Amino acid sequence: QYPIINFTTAGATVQSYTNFIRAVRGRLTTGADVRHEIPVLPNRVGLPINQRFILVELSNHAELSVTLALDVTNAYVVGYRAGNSAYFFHPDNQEDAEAITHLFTDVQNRYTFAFGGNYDRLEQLAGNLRENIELGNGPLEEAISALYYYSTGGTQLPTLARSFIICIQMISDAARFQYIEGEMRTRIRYNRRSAPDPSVITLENSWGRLSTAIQESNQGAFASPIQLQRRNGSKFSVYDVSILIPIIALMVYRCAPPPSSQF
Amino acid sequence: QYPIINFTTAGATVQSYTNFIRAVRGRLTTGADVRHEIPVLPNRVGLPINQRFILVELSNHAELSVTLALDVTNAYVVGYRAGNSAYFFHPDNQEDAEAITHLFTDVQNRYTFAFGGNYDRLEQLAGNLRENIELGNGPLEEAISALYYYSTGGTQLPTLARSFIICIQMISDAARFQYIEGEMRTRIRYNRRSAPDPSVITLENSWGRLSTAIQESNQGAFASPIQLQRRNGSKFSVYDVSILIPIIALMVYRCAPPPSSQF
């Protein structure tokens, strides 16, 4: 009953991936809430459970499928289903633990991992940092297979963690940032796989802080700058929402918008 | 040979005034230079004399006409012609004095006033502040007649100065600020005459500072806020170009734009 968006790595093109990410954004955010031209995800406070999640059904050339569940309030992957088994990251709190009972409700085998699905924890489990995990259509094809075979013993934990890291960046971070979507489109267009450069990593790491700075800004002006990195690792200072309009596609809700207060 | 734009107070409507101000902006600025969506006037440095001025020919229901000359670099009224006489405000420097010799070149009687055409000086001569000089179609009709009769002794100096104050705000300031154009459209729509409120005056006074703050901003963010006033005289702080996009229509050139420096 939650909305489902389908994507396959089989014969993926720039256009099919673009259509997919556009659909995911459409199901994450409603259009109610736009601050300086940038959409905001729904506020978790008071959000009915029937509106809390979306499902991303991923297929690959190997004819395998898995379904990821994303929380609309922050675009996080909270768990996944493959066949008759579902797995959820360790919940942050009791409300989240209750919420995930509403996902994959007829699956025969439900498991909750003891570990969370944040980047730091997943990198520790993978034995590799994001800067050393290749992304692209081949990585995603492989990730889907690894998730699919987990329940039968074919996938070691570090490979499972790597596979989550790939899915999260190629789906959640691409949905959060047009810039990251653009980086994945380029990989698909040239069928190349490559680890994310510092511009990608620093955006991933800064999403919450950027969301807050934009929402709490004075007419778009940040009280304090945010340091990002360029592709070559050099510093890029962000002082204003304006420079981020081509870059960030949606924000986590961090405060209510101030009154319009137009001149 | 300089471009001429015509306007008449006779049967003026919101649409005829809108057309006029749009034309004036079109002849002031070329489109070369836009910073944060706001056009900039040409830089005075290196600007050829054949591109330096525009002419605004004003007529009224009394069947009188005068021609104002505006400097494209700052939208200032520098002088005017009525029939066989022309009058220029006292030039700021030698280059400006030479420049005005290229205006109204066949007029039989040329005069340069000893006083400048800035608001402070004109208010002193008028014996009234802007806050006590009514604007609207009636004031402008009257101003055109007063300018027209100056050379024949019919217009006292304080009335001449008042008449300049009306023309400058209704033409130059309306061209500089959509907000001020909007205030003059309202006066025309309801055929009411009324002095400018504090929102109008503070914008007029702040045009140079706003131009500089926008041009020198960090991605649109001002280093220091600018205080304006609302219609009721209360303070309104400006921290960013964004809030000014509906308000200011063109800027005086204050610096070269920094490199694009997109992420």
Swiss-Prot record, chains A, B:
Q: What is the effect of changing D71 to A/E/N?
A: Suppresses the toxic activity
Q: How is it used?
A: A deglycosylated form may be linked to monoclonal antibodies to produce immunotoxins exploited in cancer treatment. However, a point mutation should be introduced to eliminate vascular leak syndrome, a side effect resulting from endothelial damage.
Residues annotated to bind AMP: Y76, V77, G117, N118, Y119
Chain positions carrying an annotated carbohydrate: N6, N232
* Known outcome of mutating R44A: No effect on the toxic activity but suppresses the vascular leak syndrome
Please list the residues that make up the active site: Y76, Y119, D173, R176
Q: Which residues does the annotation say bind a carbohydrate?
A: I4, I5, N6, G11, G46, N137, G138, P139, L140, E141, E142, N191, R192, R193
Purpose of the protein: Acts as a glycosidase that removes a specific adenine residue from an exposed loop of the 28S rRNA (A4324 in mammals), leading to rRNA breakage. As this loop is involved in elongation factor binding, modified ribosomes are catalytically inactive and unable to support protein synthesis. Can inactivate a few thousand ribosomes per minute, faster than the cell can make new ones. Therefore a single molecule can kill an animal cell.
Full protein name? Ricin A chain
Q: Which organism is it from?
A: Ricinus communis (Castor bean)
Q: What is the lineage of its organism?
A: Eukaryota, Viridiplantae, Streptophyta, Embryophyta, Tracheophyta
Q: Which residues of the full protein are shown?
A: 40 to 302 of 576
